[PDB]
C-alpha cells in the first residue's frame, strides 16, 4: 500500500518569556520516528522509533543542525509576520510548517507538499504542481515574490520528488518489521441495557495498524450510512489504533445486522454478529 | 531526512 514521510514544525512566540517554543516532529506513515523540542535538555534531534536509532552519528549531527536552522528561521519569520500584519510585540503567535512526500504500492513518487500557516490559517502553500504558490493575502504575496525570486519551488521540487522518496524507501526497508507490518484489528461487541425498548450495542476495533480503517453498517440484508455516530480514530499509545461505531438503533431485540470491517491485512472484510 | 534546501524565511 501507499506510504509517506511527513515533517511537522510548530513555533510559538512567548512575549517576555525569552525565545519561542519550537517543536519539530517526523513521521513515516502513522509512526513518529524523530523529535526535537527547543525546551528539551538534549538540544538534539532524538529518535522515537527503534529502526532510526541505527543511523550513525553523522546522520544525527546533520538532522540536529538542520532542525535547529529551522528553529531559528521560524524565529525570524515570527518577527517579520508581526510586521506584515501590523501586530504589537505583545501577544503570542504561531507559525506552522509541514512537508512530505507520498508513494504508492510501487514505492514510486505520487505527490509532494509543503505548506506554511500563521495563527492557524493558511499563509503560503506549494500547489500540487511543484512550481506554483498559493498566496493567501497581500502579506503572503510578498513572501511569494521573494520565494519565486529565489526559486524555492524548484529546490523544494528537488527534495520532495527525489531525496524525500529516496529516504522514505530507505526507512521502509530498514524499518521492515515495523513500517511494513500490518496488525489486523481485534474486533469486539458489548451492550449495557437501559430500559429494554432502547439500549445500546457497541462495535469496537482495537490494536490495529495502520490507522486507515473503514467500519460501516448494513442491516436487514441492505445498507445505509447517515445516522450511526462514530468516533475519530484514536491512538492506543503503544503504536496501534482504536475506533468504534456504536448502534443507536436499539429495538428491544436488536434486529439482524453486523459491522463490515474493511482494513488492509484482514484477508476478507470481517463481520461481527451479536449473540449472547 | 530533513530537507537541506528550500527552507527560507518568509
Amino acid at each position: 500500500g501507499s506510504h509517506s514521510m511527513r515533517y511537522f514544525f510548530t513555533s510559538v512566540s512567548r512575549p517576555g518569556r525569552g525565545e519561542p517554543r519550537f517543536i519539530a516532529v517526523g513521521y513515516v506513515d502513522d509512526t513518529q520516528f524523530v523529535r526535537f523540542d527547543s525546551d528539551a535538555a538534549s538540544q538534539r534531534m532524538e529518535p522515537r522509533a527503534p529502526w532510526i536509532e541505527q543511523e550513525g552519528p553523522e546522520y544525527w549531527d546533520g538532522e540536529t543542525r538542520k532542525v535547529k536552522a529551522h528553529s531559528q528561521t521560524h524565529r525570524v519569520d515570527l518577527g517579520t509576520l508581526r510586521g506584515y500584519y501590523n501586530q504589537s510585540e505583545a501577544g503570542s503567535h504561531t507559525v506552522q510548517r509541514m512537508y512530505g512526500c507520498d508513494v504508492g504500492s510501487d514505492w514510486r513518487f505520487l505527490r509532494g507538499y509543503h505548506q506554511y500557516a500563521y495563527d492557524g490559517k493558511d499563509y503560503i502553500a506549494l500547489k500540487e504542481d511543484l512550481r506554483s504558490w498559493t498566496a493567501a493575502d497581500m502579506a503572503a504575496q510578498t513572501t511569494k515574490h521573494k520565494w519565486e525570486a529565489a526559486h524555492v519551488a524548484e529546490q523544494l521540487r528537488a527534495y520532495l520528488e527525489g531525496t524525500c522518496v529516496e529516504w522514505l524507501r530507505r526507512y521502509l526497508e530498514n524499518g521492515k518489521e515495523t513500517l511494513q507490518r500490518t496488525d489486523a484489528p481485534k474486533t469486539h461487541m458489548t451492550h449495557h441495557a437501559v430500559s429494554d425498548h432502547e439500549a445500546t450495542l457497541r462495535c469496537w476495533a482495537l490494536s490495529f495498524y495502520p490507522a486507515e480503517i473503514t467500519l460501516t453498517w448494513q442491516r436487514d440484508g441492505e445498507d445505509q450510512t447517515q445516522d450511526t455516530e462514530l468516533v475519530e480514530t484514536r491512538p492506543a499509545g503503544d503504536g496501534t489504533f482504536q475506533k468504534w461505531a456504536a448502534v443507536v438503533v436499539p429495538s428491544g431485540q436488536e434486529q439482524r445486522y453486523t459491522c463490515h470491517v474493511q482494513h488492509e491485512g484482514l484477508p476478507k472484510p470481517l463481520t461481527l454478529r451479536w449473540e449472547p | 531526512e530533513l530537507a537541506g534546501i528550500g527552507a527560507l524565511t518568509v
Epitope: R65, K66, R75, V76, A158, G162 | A7, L8
Partner: T-cell receptor, first 109, second 116 residues
Framework: QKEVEQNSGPLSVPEGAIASLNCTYS??????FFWYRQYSGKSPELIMF????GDKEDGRFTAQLNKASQHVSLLIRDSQPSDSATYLC?????????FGDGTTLTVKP | MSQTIHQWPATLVQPVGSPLSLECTVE??????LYWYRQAAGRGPQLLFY??????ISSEVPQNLSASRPQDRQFILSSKKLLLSDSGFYLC?????????????FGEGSRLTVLE
C-alpha cells in the same frame, strides 16, 4: 573514511583543452554541492553550485552531479593559464559546507 | 544594495601565548548564518563555528578558540592565549537565513602565524 575526496594534483592541461575535476563524497544525505576556485594566497571564490542531478553550465564552467555514485564533476572548457588554481569541492551535509582538500590545476600556455 | 563580506585584519604575526581577535562584517542581507573556517596548507577549510542569526548551531568544540556575534552582521573570533597549533588561514563566510542556495561567499580571509 574521507568525507570528500579529490585527487590532489597538480593536474596539467594544455591551454585550450577541457579540464575535468572529479570529486567523491561519502555522506548519503548531502543535498547541495559547490565548487570554489582558490588562487595562491587568496580565499576561495564560489564558482558554482547545484542541487539536482545532471549538468549545470555557467560560461566555461559545467558542474555535474551523479547521486547514485556520489560523484560531482567540474569541467572547464577552453582552459586558460589564468584558470591555474586549486579547485575545492564542497558538499553540504546539513546547514554547513564540508570541503575536500582540492585539486591543484595548472594550465600550460 | 547587494551582498558583501569583509574580515580584518588580513595578516597577523604573533607569539605563542598572546590573545587573538579577528573581525567579520557582512552587508546586503539580514539575519544571516555566519561561519568561521580554518584552512591549513594543502588542505580544505575546516569548520570551527556555525552560527545562526540567534546563536551557535555547530556542536564542535575547537580547543582554545571561541566565537561571538555582538550584532546581527558582526562576527568575532578570539582566543585568550594562542598555541603554535593555531597558525592558519581563518576564513569567514555567510549564507542566507535558513537552508538555501543564497550566499555561501567567503571573506578575504585572515592569515595567522604563531611563533615560538
Amino acid at each position: 573514511q574521507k568525507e570528500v575526496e579529490q585527487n590532489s594534483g597538480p593536474l596539467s592541461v594544455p591551454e585550450g583543452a577541457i579540464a575535468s575535476l572529479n570529486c567523491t563524497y561519502s555522506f548519503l544525505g548531502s543535498q547541495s554541492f559547490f565548487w570554489y576556485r582558490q588562487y595562491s594566497g587568496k580565499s576561495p571564490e564560489l564558482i558554482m553550485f547545484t542541487y539536482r542531478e545532471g549538468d549545470k553550465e555557467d560560461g566555461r564552467f559545467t558542474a555535474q552531479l551523479n547521486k547514485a555514485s556520489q560523484h560531482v564533476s567540474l569541467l572547464i572548457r577552453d582552459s586558460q593559464p589564468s584558470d591555474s588554481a586549486t579547485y575545492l569541492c564542497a558538499v553540504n551535509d546539513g546547514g554547513r559546507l564540508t570541503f575536500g582538500d582540492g585539486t591543484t590545476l595548472t594550465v600550460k600556455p | 544594495m547587494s551582498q558583501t563580506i569583509h574580515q580584518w585584519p588580513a595578516t597577523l604575526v604573533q607569539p605563542v601565548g598572546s590573545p587573538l581577535s579577528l573581525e567579520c562584517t557582512v552587508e546586503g542581507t539580514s539575519n544571516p548564518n555566519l561561519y568561521w573556517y580554518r584552512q591549513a596548507a594543502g588542505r580544505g577549510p575546516q569548520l570551527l563555528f556555525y552560527w545562526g542569526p540567534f546563536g551557535q548551531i555547530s556542536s564542535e568544540v575547537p580547543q582554545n578558540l571561541s566565537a561571538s556575534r555582538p550584532q546581527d552582521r558582526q562576527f568575532i573570533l578570539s582566543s585568550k592565549k594562542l598555541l603554535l597549533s593555531d597558525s592558519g588561514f581563518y576564513l569567514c563566510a555567510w549564507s542566507e537565513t535558513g537552508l538555501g542556495m543564497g550566499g555561501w561567499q567567503f571573506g578575504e580571509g585572515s592569515r595567522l602565524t604563531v611563533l615560538e
